[PDB]
Symmetry: D2
């Protein structure tokens, strides 16, 4: 089996031959057709997060492929299905959060391409109970971002409380933000999209945004206040200190700021104003299995189309180099 | 009419005589039996808050008195009723937040003892539509802190989402905390009380706390996780950097931290861990008129008893710098 | 002033000159341009409801016009605005439901066209605090049904708990249903529209329905179950016993049936299945002033277009027996 | 193994020796210490429900006992634990409802003592994933009714939306009602208890009820409206036509009526008034595994104590005929 392997942190990945996974009870083997790439894989490759991955590691948490083998007793998933192996690789099923449909918080969870070998290979293994069933409408390459950017942003907009007709602000129309934009519109929301580029403001407007702001030409918060009077919710994707503060202060009283990005250090919040304005700051990333089904259904109905460009497994270090220089407009999917 | 007046910021209040208020339509004149004092009155006297009160100012937002005069058209309040003038002196009645029962967020709101003359006098004026109706069961000295600490902490626990049988952490057993703890117990909650003193821990235990922690002898986040497994909600009264730090870390995954104190500068939060653990940070101060009714009823049912000491209007500057040195165990109420 | 008056029940309305309304404080006089007609006006003319209107009565609760005169101290509405005088003519502003933004449930409420003279006239009076401000985009004759059918069905879909992406069933594509359709579509919902005619099936599919069913040709409950597996929510507009039964049994487990129609008598429900399936049966009619602004905004943005026929005020009784035999495809509005 | 077996519906149960259960993977063998009895067992023995149990059947869904054998791969349940085998014997774990923590609605669920042999025996089998963990504080006999009556009524009060300080009404203080009012009091609610006996009125008053009503001496609807102005929520345990209407009309506008009883036929509801008052009728029985843990914790803390009388397995037909005559004051638990 060919696989791109992280041998040790910061040092380039080695495309090399390794054994195929063998199944234990409840697992299926997936012949990978595609696997999306995002910044989580980078942080997995660099090991710069608080809890580090197990080396050597096959990254990838957006693998889409065909089930070619099922272990004894797997009935729900059948050989031939097209499934996804997401970030939420497995959960305990018995804890506080598993019992209440909050599988994303399970303290015993395994994470695909981080705590366990992911889809940067020709075959990947996963538990039948946690794979995502890909709808028949969708190509594996175009769907792979939904397993990550899709479910994360869709769940964040549910968490935000924004109801149809209300205004939402999305700070950062990058990898996730350009996908967060289409979910918001499909959820009956009016969107103000905020970025730092005339190109992305054009991108956002073409993807459906009602208002696009080049944040380096207009102060976005007083433009949001002057035009729509503040937003009921704001999705903070860009988590640099300025965009986070700007996303916060765009939220009117009694509104919610949902943060979906993972910043490098702590972030300051004017708690003083937070108390007198009844504002909430909620954290949210990825989603529950039920969240996954709904996120994928929006794509199956055509309401959310990721901007994708394919790359070969061998180019994985060049995609990473390309990702650190910020020249990825959208997301890049590995093809197999 | 005798009144304690702020003529200039940070200089001592002058007890002196001044005009009785005369009513325009919709307002009532109450002769004040008692008026509580909290730190908000001092921040009005020092004017160290972003938006300052215009001088001269009669402070006091916890005034309880007897209606002795009603303007023309006052259908509700009658002469002889015992009413309270709270922090939410008035609201527009037609904005976004007034139509949805969120009067605390009205951008045109006037605040008792800050933007309008309050209860540091023998007579105060207030609109009939926004005065609190004090229940017949209670003594004006006993119920004045409910108008502030009572409704604030009760509404905070409501928005905390903590349900009967769940565990709540209250950081700061001070003016608000000792009242917050009684409300939590009355809502079926198990309480962990956290403070900086063996005496305050022995105060919270007496008031009903299931667990009381001296924060300078045990690591409180160590004890809460070891004994309870993290709390579902935490009320942050003490908003110093380390207490805010500990209160946050005591909330388990998916839980909410409600902040009720007003800090002097921004506060840092590990937004990284906030995202991965689905944690919410909500701000909450004071409560709506409906909130005020429900808070007063708990006190009318004997479930909340504020620890109160009396003082008279002339020693108002002595209670202020007694408050700044921090040995007011509970709250003080002005006697008239 | 010309007005269509109900002198007594079940006999024809008389067009007749009457006195122009006198404005007391807080009220406003409106020169009516158009006033909608629905079945509530008929029940008001026939007096066949539990609590009857006191006679003589000028019906009409969907009146749209120009304010020509404001009383003393009218704070918000200035002469020249276009407003609407809905079914909730006024509320006390003090009770349990007024304080929490549930003004529709105020036990002291007055109802336009029923408890007070409505818009079946050239001029109508209404309190400034409770008239709907029509947006500038909309012409008075097409927006009149939003005051009734628009705010009712929109609030009903909010009460239903149906979230974007989910399926809803709308039983009855009549007056309220054809408007319910568009609101649901604008809220991200997929819609199954059920009625008794091939003509209304195309009517629903014409305005956005994903599925239309002629209830007299297919079993709609088996159709809904075979095609979408039951609906999270169902809106019951047709409250004849067979449509109510079908609407209920189209709701899946854990779902909600919102009823907006007003039936003649009690209706039977399989509470046995309600208990074991976790189903809710909620009632909802009209909407609060906030609900009215939101429902009006959807029409302002062209997302809800009522199907409308004009008639002169003198044809009112022709419109009524027209209505009693089901000739009306949509709604009819009086023109002035 | 000794067991009470239903060989044929309506004909007495036979206490007879049968084969003890054999373990397949994931299951545990429990030696029953106690097993409560309720009317669900009666309807299982009479086979008078829509979907009947297949015979022969060992009833019992409140069996408490000690685990004496676990199949291989069972690691969470350990030999020696005291577990419960509730009505929710097993769920599929993948459907719409199992994914969202609503496993009570799983269409593939198996029911203890109905779809599979239950606790009317010395040994009963159950899946480890779905047994209830009995707290160490409590004796198997007094904890058995928590498995049924306890979790049902606790969930129904959670579904009722009733919040601390608000008033609840419990109609029928029999088997479920006398556990319901304890839960309500433990959740900070004020309880009006309604029955048809002065002996049960006093029983409720002894168990914590704030007001007890004998419905056959006072009109309970006028008593509730005149003493408290209607209740925000009402639990309907007695589902006879008269008490169902009384429970409904006890609910004030915007309130919720939760029904936990299983009536024999459809019940009429004045849908006309349901719409105009915005009242909800919700159905709720048994609870989720998480609900079971919270229900059991209230008993562990001593806030819910069922009224229990012991009988022996051989007297199973004599408690049944005791049950049909209505001589059961509370609940009766079989002892082994
Ligand atoms: Zn990703
Ligand atoms: Zn878990
Ligand atoms: Zn306002
Ligand atoms: Zn205060
Ligand atoms: Zn109408
Ligand atoms: Zn009212
Ligand atoms: Zn039972
Ligand atoms: Zn299931």
């Amino acid at each position: 089996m060919k696989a791109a392997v992280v041998n040790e942190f910061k040092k380039a990945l080695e495309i090399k031959e390794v054994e195929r996974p063998k199944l234990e009870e409840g697992e299926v083997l997936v012949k990978i057709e595609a696997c999306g790439v995002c910044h989580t894989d980078l942080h997995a490759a660099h090991g710069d997060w608080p809890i580090k991955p197990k080396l050597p590691l096959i990254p990838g948490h957006e693998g889409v492929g065909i089930v070619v083998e099922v272990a004894k007793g797997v009935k729900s998933i059948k050989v031939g299905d097209r499934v996804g192996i997401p970030w939420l690789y497995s959960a305990c099923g018995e804890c506080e959060y598993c019992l209440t449909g909050q599988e994303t918080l399970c303290p015993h969870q395994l994470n695909g391409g981080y705590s366990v070998d992911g889809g940067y290979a020709e075959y990947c293994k996963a538990p039948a109970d946690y794979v995502a069933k890909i709808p028949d409408n969708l190509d594996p390459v175009e769907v792979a971002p939904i397993l990550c950017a899709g479910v994360t942003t869709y769940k964040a907009l549910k968490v935000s409380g924004a109801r149809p007709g209300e205004w939402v602000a999305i700070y950062g129309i990058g990898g996730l933000g350009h996908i967060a934009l289409q979910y918001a519109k499909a959820m009956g929301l009016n969107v103000v999209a905020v970025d730092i580029s005339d190109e992305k403001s054009k991108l956002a407007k073409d993807l459906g945004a009602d208002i696009a702001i080049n944040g380096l030409k207009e102060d976005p918060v007083k433009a949001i206040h002057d035009q729509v009077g503040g937003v009921h919710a704001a999705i903070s994707v860009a988590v640099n200190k300025k965009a986070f503060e700007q996303a916060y202060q765009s939220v009117k009283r009694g509104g919610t700021l949902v943060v979906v990005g993972l910043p490098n250090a702590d972030l300051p919040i004017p708690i003083f104003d937070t108390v007198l304005n009844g504002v909430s700051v909620k954290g949210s990333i990825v989603g529950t299995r039920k969240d996954m089904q709904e996120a994928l259904d929006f794509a199956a109905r055509g309401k959310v189309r990721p901007i994708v460009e394919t790359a070969e497994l061998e180019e994985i270090n060049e995609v990473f180099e390309r990702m650190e220089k910020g020249k990825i407009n959208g997301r890049i999917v590995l093809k197999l």
